[PDB]
Design a protein around this nucleic acid. Structure first.
Ligand SMILES: [K+]
Ligand SMILES: [K+]
Ligand SMILES: [Mg+2]
Ligand SMILES: [Mg+2]
Ligand SMILES: [Mg+2]
Ligand SMILES: [Mg+2]
Ligand SMILES: [Mg+2]
Length: 41
RNA sequence: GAACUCGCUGUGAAGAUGCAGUGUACCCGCGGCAAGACGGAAAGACCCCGUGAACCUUUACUAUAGCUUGACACUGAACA
């Protein structure tokens, strides 16, 4: 799952970095805690 | 089924009131008895048959609930 990082996340990247994560990591952590957003445009 | 519904010895789907031969016997009740009418009752339960049934058994066959195995999914993060 492609997401855009918003907060600086460790072992991933920085603000605006396009990165592929496992869907569970995005769905259950990064998105609900406001660390990433889905790469919608 | 209908009867004007005797004995005997034979004959005969082979154990006869009903056939043959023969013997006996006037017509009709009532009380009794059960030897026979292969008496009545129940489409033999035994026995066999039907490519009949049911339920039961099991290391008969084929399945299958359940139980159990792993893969993928729900399921992610740091090195090992
Ligand atoms: K006679
Ligand atoms: K009798
Ligand atoms: Mg006789
Ligand atoms: Mg009498
Ligand atoms: Mg009597
Ligand atoms: Mg009888
Ligand atoms: Mg019969």
């Amino acid at each position: 799952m492609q997401v855009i990082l918003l907060d600086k996340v460790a072992n991933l990247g920085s603000l605006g970095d396009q990165v592929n994560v496992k869907a569970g990591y995005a769905r259950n952590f990064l998105v609900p805690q406001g660390k990433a957003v889905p790469a919608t445009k």
